[PDB]
Design a protein around this ligand. Structure first.
Ligand SMILES: *[C@@H]1O[C@H](CO)[C@@H](O[C@@H]2O[C@H](CO)[C@@H](O[C@@H]3O[C@H](CO[C@H]4O[C@H](CO)[C@@H](O)[C@H](O[C@H]5O[C@H](CO)[C@@H](O)[C@H](O)[C@@H]5O[C@H]5O[C@H](CO)[C@@H](O)[C@H](O)[C@@H]5O)[C@@H]4O)[C@@H](O)[C@H](O[C@H]4O[C@H](CO)[C@@H](O)[C@H](O)[C@@H]4O[C@H]4O[C@H](CO)[C@@H](O)[C@H](O)[C@@H]4O)[C@@H]3O)[C@H](O)[C@H]2NC(C)=O)[C@H](O)[C@H]1NC(C)=O
Ligand SMILES: O=C(c1cc(OCC2CCOCC2)nc(C2CC2)c1)N1Cc2ccc(C(=O)N3CCc4onc(O)c4C3)cc2C1
Ligand SMILES: [Ca+2]
Ligand SMILES: [Ca+2]
Ligand SMILES: [Cl-]
Ligand SMILES: [K+]
Ligand code: NA
Ligand SMILES: [Zn+2]
Length: 805
């Protein structure tokens, strides 16, 4: 209900929105259908356009005009943005050479540099280079400020999840906006782009920037713009707010544009029609910069130019239809398009079985353009499972394709040539970042980073303490001239034991046979010294990882590898080893094939046993330090210690063996040695965090040996590959993975072939950040390097995407 009967005189674009039924005059009143009767007349003036002309210079103010060219306009803050250019002989900002902004050059009364966030929907990363000739204003921001070559969105690469991530620093699964369309089964309510339900505050979790600001006494402009407010009026409003007195003027502002996304959907990302919306956005940027220049704020404000996601070529004809796969297609509900989410049409359907659905959708056509997952089996880098709003059944859709339920959904609705929503590592989904201002660096290019990191940086720019979020605060310090955030390494919670030889061989009854009864003081003090950690400098390059939770574990030293062995999980948390460029692969000798040896440093009671694997017909075992890479046949015995064994499904063994026997050596050749840290992950509740012991859902039959849901490896080397990994003097290079520990390879459609035709493809899909692994394990890596801690935080956030440039 609305009493649209009140007035908007002097309340135009009000910052404090009023409550029903009193009539609103804020930038969203239209979208709620609640504007006072006189809103259009007073707040959406258009008379005489958006530009001064020589005829208007020194006009008599007339309050009907959209903007002003009267002598008084600057003190009132409502000049047309081009007023000084036309009337006072100034240049457009874009025509001025850039000059380093060493300090904020702000009017007296400004307590901090204001922040303006200029967000462009669907602005694909490659537009910065491909459109540079038609976007001079943006081009000057980019070249003179700090820029990345791209910024990685979150999954799914849609509008509301990304905008809300930019606002909060949270993954979708945590902030709650997991799609542009959602069903919440707890509320029994639906969220859609279109309609009113999306305005209900129960959808929107975490704490977005404007709330963070307000709670710490920093005043915010309204972030949201009804689609009917023209861009020029959004810019003028922001400029007018910037002219307010000290106690009223906001410190943080946002401009949002629906372009180039609107046009990209109709014409495709590089359609010839796209040039004009890129020109129009650049013009809007030039109005903002000219406007700031006339207010003498162009060297005072920090400007962020950012997008939500990119845009791919997608047409009607590249639709997969589930009615080609499923006999029961009317018993499901599908959220369709560039991703798929499936649930039962009716929860009273006891015949609905997700396993048979998944099975019917798996590797059925030879170039099938989607892949079905249970949500817990999606790549852990997507962080796309821990929310009741995400359906159990997910379809990851190939770039350039759609998925739909039946043909009638896609022709009773080709219109469009563009779409987005794909996997967030897909190059077409990448978007933009530029920072320009006194707190940003000058003419600096920074590596690509994830949009989950920006909220912290926006908080640093405003002097705010960020709410808890998924950013890694300090990982983006290299973008900032000042206001950097300098954290301390987390404190180690559990200190390790360093056990010696405490158990006789006959105390063990492992059902584990080993033919190792195969016999000198030269070599005996040398093997003793390896057990006490004499090669640890070699295999533990960056220090031991710290354990950030309360537990019982032991450090175990060996010739070729070092491990942190959990007495609670009966296996290593981590195993660390260095393979040089020269290392030789050998094979497992036949006198050791099914050998597992007791580790006389670790109790039988805190050891695994072979009998449990023998009895478990589904489960087998592998090794964390690969016996294939042992340095000598004497050191090879260490690799068969029971304390280096981990539970593995035979299907996963094919992956792991190929990684260890073929890929590690290959990476050592390419990178000039590698350091490898490998271990188990337990995330049975798919929350992205280390499981406690009581969350573990599966054990090796008849034992207390828990089964990992994933295995990780972190592969580190020298960024300058002319130095070996063990004598690196400068920055590091890293690639990692979190491989799903699955009992089949249904994921890999070509898995009946040789491992050289499918394993690497699987590993690429499950590439990970170190930081992902840290959350999943409760470990902290890279504790002892030469490098600054912020540089190490940048490293830990790196994702190796395997996409071309
Ligand atoms: C990414 O960054 C974020 C932010 O840092 C990380 O998420 C945090 O994860 C924490 C651990 O999972 C979690 O802490 C829990 O908080 C519970 C109280 O939470 C409410 O209050 C906070 C603060 O205002 C608020 O943030 C929460 O918001 C969530 O829920 C609302 C719904 O109201 C959503 O709108 C919002 O989107 C958000 O949803 C997300 O998180 C929840 C979990 O909180 C998920 O369920 C959703 O899917 C979604 O992901 C809340 O409004 C508190 O109950 C927890 O405590 C339980 O467990 C501890 C063990 O330490 C125990 O001591 C407690 O007693 C309690 O146990 C009891 O409850 C159990 C469960 O019901 C029960 O089984 C037991 O028997 C006990 O009786 C816990 O402290 C924190 O909430 C979130 N924050 C956010 C914003 O998500 C995230 O982990 C990072 N991701 C990665 C990969 O690093
Ligand atoms: O003003 C905002 C806005 C802005 C916003 O900004 C959050 C900021 C962003 C920068 O960093 C700080 C947080 N957030 C939010 C909310 C998360 C809090 C909203 N709008 C208006 C508007 C109008 C229409 C639509 C829309 O339906 N489409 C256009 C884009 C698109 O692409 N494909 C498609 O189909 C569509 C269809 C979306 C918005 C977002
Ligand atoms: Ca968008
Ligand atoms: Ca977990
Ligand atoms: Cl969606
Ligand atoms: K077995
Ligand atoms: Na397969
Ligand atoms: Zn779109």
């Amino acid at each position: 209900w609305t009493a649209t009967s009140g007035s908007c005189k002097g309340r135009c674009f009000e910052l404090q929105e009023v409550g029903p039924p009193d009539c609103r005059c804020d930038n969203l009143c239209k979208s709620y259908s609640s504007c006072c009767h006189d809103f259009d007349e007073l707040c959406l003036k258009t008379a005489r356009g958006w530009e001064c002309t020589k005829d208007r210079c020194g006009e008599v103010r007339n309050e009907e005009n959209a903007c002003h060219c009267s002598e008084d306009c600057l003190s009132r803050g409502d000049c047309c943005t081009n007023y000084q250019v036309v009337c006072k002989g100034e240049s457009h900002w874009v025509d001025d050479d850039c000059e380093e902004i060493k300090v904020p050059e702000c009017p007296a009364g400004f307590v901090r540099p204001p922040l303006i966030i200029f967000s462009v929907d669907g602005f694909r990363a490659s537009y910065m280079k491909k459109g540079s000739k038609v976007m001079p204003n943006i081009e000057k921001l980019r070249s003179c400020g700090t820029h990345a070559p791209y910024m990685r969105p979150v999954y799914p690469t849609k509008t509301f999840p990304n905008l809300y991530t930019l606002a909060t620093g949270l993954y979708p699964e945590s902030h709650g906006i997991v799609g542009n369309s959602m069903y919440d089964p707890v509320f029994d309510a639906s969220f859609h782009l279109r309609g009113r339900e999306k305005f209900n505050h129960r959808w929107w979790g975490g704490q977005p920037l404007w709330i963070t600001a307000t709670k710490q006494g920093v005043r915010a402009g309204t972030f949201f713009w009804s689609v009917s407010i023209p861009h020029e009026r959004r810019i003028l409003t922001i400029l007018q707010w910037l002219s307010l007195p000290d106690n009223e003027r906001p410190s943080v502002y946002a401009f949002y544009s629906e372009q180039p996304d609107f046009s990209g959907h109709k014409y495709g990302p590089f359609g010839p029609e796209m040039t004009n919306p890129l020109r129009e956005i650049d013009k809007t940027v030039g109005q903002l910069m000219d406007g700031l220049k006339q207010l003498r704020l162009h060297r005072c404000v920090n400007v962020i130019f950012v997008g939500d996601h990119g845009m791919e070529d997608v047409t009607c004809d590249r639709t997969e239809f589930l009615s080609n796969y499923l006999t029961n297609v009317d018993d499901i509900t599908l959220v369709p398009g560039t991703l798929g989410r499936i649930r039962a049409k009716s929860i009273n359907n006891s015949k609905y079985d997700p396993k048979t659905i998944i099975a019917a959708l798996t590797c059925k056509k030879p170039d099938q353009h989607f892949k079905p997952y249970m949500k817990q089996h999606l790549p852990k880098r997507l962080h796309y499972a821990n929310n009741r709003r995400i359906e159990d059944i997910h379809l990851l859709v190939d770039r350039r394709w759609h998925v739909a339920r039946k043909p009638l959904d896609v022709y009773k609705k080709c219109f469009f040539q563009g779409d987005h929503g794909f996997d967030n590592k897909v190059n077409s989904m990448q978007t933009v970042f530029v920072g320009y201002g006194p707190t940003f660096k000058y003419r600096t290019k920074v590596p690509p980073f994830e949009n989950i990191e920006l909220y912290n940086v926006m908080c640093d720019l405003l002097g705010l303490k960020p709410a808890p979020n998924n950013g890694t605060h300090g990982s983006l310090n290299h973008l900032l001239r000042t206001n950097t955030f300098r954290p301390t390494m987390p404190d180690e919670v559990s200190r390790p034991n360093y056990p010696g030889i405490m158990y006789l061989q006959s105390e063990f009854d492992l059902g584990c046979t080993c033919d190792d009864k195969v016999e000198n003081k030269l070599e005996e003090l040398n093997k003793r010294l390896h057990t006490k950690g004499s090669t640890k400098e070699r295999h533990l390059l960056y220090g031991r990882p710290a354990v950030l939770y309360r537990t019982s574990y032991d450090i175990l030293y060996h010739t070729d590898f070092e491990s942190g062995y959990s007495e609670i999980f009966l296996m290593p948390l981590w195993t660390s080893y260095t393979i040089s460029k020269q290392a030789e692969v050998s094979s497992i000798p036949e006198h050791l094939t099914n050998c597992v040896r007791p580790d006389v440093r670790v109790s039988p009671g805190f050891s695994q046993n072979c009998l449990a694997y023998k009895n478990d017909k589904q489960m087998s075992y592998g090794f964390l330090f690969p016996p294939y890479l042992s340095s000598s046949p004497e050191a090879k015995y260490d690799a068969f210690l029971v304390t280096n064994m981990v539970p593995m499904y035979p299907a996963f063994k094919r992956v792991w063996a190929y990684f260890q026997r073929v890929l590690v050596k290959k990476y050592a050749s390419e990178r000039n040695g590698v350091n490898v840290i490998s271990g188990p992950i337990f995330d049975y509740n798919y929350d992205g965090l280390r499981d406690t012991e009581d969350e573990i859902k599966q054990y090796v039959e008849g034992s207390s040996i828990p089964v990992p849901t994933h295995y990780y490896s972190i592969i580190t080397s020298c960024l300058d590959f002319t130095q070996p990994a063990d004598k690196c003097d400068g920055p590091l290079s890293v690639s990692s993975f979190i491989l799903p520990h699955r009992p089949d390879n249904d994921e890999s459609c070509n898995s009946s072939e040789d491992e050289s035709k499918w394993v690497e493809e699987l590993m690429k899909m499950h590439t990970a950040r170190v930081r992902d692994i840290e959350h999943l394990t409760g470990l902290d890596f890279y504790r002892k390097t030469s490098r600054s801690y912020s540089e190490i935080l940048t490293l830990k956030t790196y994702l190796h995407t395997y996409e071309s440039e």
